Amino acid sequence: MIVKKKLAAGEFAETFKNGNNITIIKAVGELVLRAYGADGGEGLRTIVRQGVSIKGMNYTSVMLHTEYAQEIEYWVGDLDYSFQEQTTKSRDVNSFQIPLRDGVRELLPEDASRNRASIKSPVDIWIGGENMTALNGIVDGGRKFEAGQEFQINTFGSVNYWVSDEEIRVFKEYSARAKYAQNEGRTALEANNVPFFDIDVPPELDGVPFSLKARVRHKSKGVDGLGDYTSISVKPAFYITEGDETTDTLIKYTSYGSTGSHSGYDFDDNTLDVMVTLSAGVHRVFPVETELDYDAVQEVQHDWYDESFTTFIEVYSDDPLLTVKGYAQILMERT
Ligand SMILES: [Ca+2]
Numbered sequence: 001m002i003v004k005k006k007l008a009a010g011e012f013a014e015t016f017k018n019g020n021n022i023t024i025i026k027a028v029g030e031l032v033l034r035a036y037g038a039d040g041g042e043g044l045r046t047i048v049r050q051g052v053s054i055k056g057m058n059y060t061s062v063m064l065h066t067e068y069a070q071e072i073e074y075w076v077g078d079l080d081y082s083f084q085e086q087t088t089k090s091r092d093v094n095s096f097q098i099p100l101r102d103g104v105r106e107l108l109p110e111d112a113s114r115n116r117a118s119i120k121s122p123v124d125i126w127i128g129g130e131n132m133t134a135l136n137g138i139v140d141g142g143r144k145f146e147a148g149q150e151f152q153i154n155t156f157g158s159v160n161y162w163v164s165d166e167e168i169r170v171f172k173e174y175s176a177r178a179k180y181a182q183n184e185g186r187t188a189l190e191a192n193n194v195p196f197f198d199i200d201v202p203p204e205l206d207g208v209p210f211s212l213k214a215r216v217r218h219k220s221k222g223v224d225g226l227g228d229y230t231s232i233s234v235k236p237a238f239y240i241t242e243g244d245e246t247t248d249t250l251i252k253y254t255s256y257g258s259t260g261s262h263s264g265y266d267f268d269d270n271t272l273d274v275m276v277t278l279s280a281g282v283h284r285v286f287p288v289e290t291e292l293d294y295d296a297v298q299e300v301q302h303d304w305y306d307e308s309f310t311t312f313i314e315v316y317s318d319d320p321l322l323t324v325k326g327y328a329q330i331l332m333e334r335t
Pocket residue numbers: 230231232233293294295
């Protein structure tokens with residue numbers, strides 16, 4: 001029978017009417033400093049201060065003497081034969097990479113076979129048990145391990161991690177109006193100060209299509225003194241090198257065109273959304289306005305490479321290969 005023993009201050013007397021576990025091995029638990037006794041016909045004493053395996057005697061009631069009032073509860077499981085032995089040894093090693101993503105997520109599952117994990121994160125990582133939370137980017141019930149720090153976990157239970165609260169990944173945010181640009185090649189766009197950013201396409205993404213997006217704001221009313229009811233046609237694009245940064249040829253990617261008098265309210269922003277398929281390596285991307293509207297030329301003397309009525313508020317991305325914060329290295333040992 002598995003039975004409780006709690007504390008408070010004075011003597012305790014738990015007298016359950018059946019010593020079936022008399023001639024029996026006691027798996028008694030013990031804290032700090034106590035004294036106990038055996039009552040089964042005779043009144044006996046006992047003093048013991050460490051978890052011990054006891055032999056059999058007669059028992060109708062248990063005596064519980066107290067020196068320290070503030071020790072902790074135990075379960076003195078008395079059983080006919082009680083033997084518990086097993087630590088291992090680990091036979092197998094398995095090495096792999098985890099997908100570090102956003103919010104508190106499980107790093108390792110409960111797995112009775114795991115002995116040991118040696119882990120290295122390429123980013124600062126917070127590690128904890130089932131209590132760990134990160135309401136608002138602030139981790140509670142966790143502790144930090146540093147980027148590049150090798151550490152070990154030797155449990156077989158859940159562990160959790162946190163690295164970031166970002167659902168997707170962000171290339172650029174611009175406040176400057178995008179320039180009008182024809183597809184004149186990489187050298188010409190750079191020479192005329194058209195802002196760009198690079199995407200480093202990993203081997204794991206070599207020729208794999210992915211979504212590239214932008215939050216795009218068109219605003220024409222009163223801009224550079226343009227008439228409030230003048231109709232401006234827009235067609236934002238990414239011009240992307242088909243080879244790498246040192247190649248000149250650009251590919252134009254588009255998803256929508258729009259026409260009207262643009263007031264540029266933040267809630268009215270458009271989304272440029274294209275699939276792009278690129279070879280491994282670095283590709284250069286020029287967010288541009290491709291349409292030079294007749295009315296802009298006449299009224300406000302707009303020309304190629306001038307600032308348009310188009311702004312790339314945010315350029316970002318949602319491909320699972322890029323939304324990952326990178327890639328924890330795991331060596332796992334199991335029985
Ligand atoms: Ca027009």
